[PDB]
Amino acid sequence: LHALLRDIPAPDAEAMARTQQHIDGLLKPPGSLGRLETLAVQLAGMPGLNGTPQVGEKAVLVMCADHGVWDEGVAVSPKIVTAIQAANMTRGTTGVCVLAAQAGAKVHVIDVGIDAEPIPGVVNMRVARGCGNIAVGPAMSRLQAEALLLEVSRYTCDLAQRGVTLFGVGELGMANTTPAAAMVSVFTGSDAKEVVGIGANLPPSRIDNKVDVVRRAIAINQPNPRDGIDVLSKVGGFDLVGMTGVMLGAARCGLPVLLDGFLSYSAALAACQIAPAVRPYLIPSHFSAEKGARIALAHLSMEPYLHMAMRLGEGSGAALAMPIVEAACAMFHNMGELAASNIVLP
Template identity: 35%
Template sequence: MIQPVSTELIKELQEKIDFKTKPIGSLGTLETIAKQIGSIQNTLSPSLSKPTILVFAGDHGIVQDQPVSPYPQEVTQQMIFNFLQGGAAINIFCNQNNIDLKIVDAGVNADFDGHTALLNYKVAKGTFNYSKKPAMTKLQLEEALNKGKTIVTDLYKNGSNIVGFGEMGIGNTSSASLLLSYFTNTPIENCVGKGTGLDDKGVNKKGEILRNVYDLHTPNIKCSEDALQHFGGFEIVMMCGAMLQAASLNMTILVDGFIVTSALLAAYYIDKNILDYCIFSHTSGEQGHKIMLDHLKVSPLLNLGMRLGEGSGVAVAFPIIQSAIAFLNKMATFKSANVSEAN
């Protein structure tokens, strides 16, 4: 159960901000972030301790016989090796901003024997093909949710109080589109985008395939967990469990793009208090992401046209969050700086 963020300190946080050497409200969104993190941590002097990005990877059965992605499934495995070797965008951005990066095998269709840097929480070697049956069993759903909670609990015990989420999985924009359609009641055709690079003909075909998938499963979906079981990937479900646990531990949650927000959307309909703990890093170039953000009534920090995934938006936005905490804790007040206040 997630507790609502404390509002007891909001007035004091606002006063602390307003007495800084600046016009009232002149730091805009930075002030909002400072108040949010102060409220999450229930302190006037919040800190960012051991910031970490978790990249969850999983494969999807749908890509084995349906053209929903221009890339073959083995790219998921290949990108895992790229992450482990430090060659991906997320590696570069995390190194740049001193963010710890952890790669999680939630359900990749490959073995990674001997790779100790990879967190092995594999549920299975990819989901079932949901053009024919639910993506996973109820037991697999529960396993993935619980493993996500375990991963975040371990981070928390190691001193982290802020965690970002990223993903990798060929075919996972299809799962995100289906979840978006279900939770927001948006026609599936409006939820489908280019993913990893489909042309217009490919997008239309993907929409037709996912319409059939949606119609097959929705009669049997009654709640968030059902939607995840039928449409999700193991990486999406594991992120959902991890996010719920992070909020229950009063950690700040940094949300990446389209796929990560689909996991957050499911978590939101399990416990709406989670939204108080979330900072949305950017607006993805994937068309369905704006629908998600508008549905949640949230404003992301950046809009750079990015649609890479991997948690890249989180890593790029992180210095903004650092700036919010830095000004709150270190900026002089009118009194300490001997600066005259406004009349």
């Protein structure tokens, strides 16, 4: 694991200099394509991309798991929805499935801790039948967290071998916005009330209780903010852990990952805390309608491309952003050159 972390490659500045120059010569006023240019320069620096902005195959990894905290009444969705939806992920009827297909990406459903029988068709990396209720103790053990990080990481980089060049990350776990909020609060030093949202339509009345849960989780566990794994194991979740795993895996493989929503921002913070080297591989998608979103993105120093007021999860925002990445590539590769048109701009 430390090995893994050790080997995360830094970006290729040489590739980035060549990209920039090229982009500057395209048929447009310099800098006119704004974020599209920056994006392209960012991809170019990703070692696994071969010195240029490009997109081969695409995949969205969906980490599924249940949470003990569901019993604290923080979620209106019935527990079994995790297991149900997970199965749906197999039939292509879910939102992430629909959007991935539209983007030509492949969805990978991973079971990291669903509280149900195993689902045929689902990748099994099950840690247990739901994680511990963070309200009265840790979600899991440190060893448990590390091992999953390792396993998901590997799975991730291995796909790289089969031609995947772009990952999208997502989750599925009833009541997951709770642990997500606790993480945010902890890494960010933000009070709970400031980052606790409605999740999957929690009624306004029920909020107060959700905030108390978060605070409790924290007081009880005393997670160390300077220790991302510590945080994850204590007030996180199997699914949060898996997401971070993808992030570490793609980074090690030198490839880009598209974040999703608030849950993903949560995992991102943890990943960045664990290995800052991860940062440059990360790519925001949309701006989640979850209350704690601005705080979280600020700490990440990220500005999403899309403003859709989405809050479904599953990696749906991720899938939605993929075309944007392809855009930047197309731009880089297919546009004509100023010089070639005898056009001179000051």
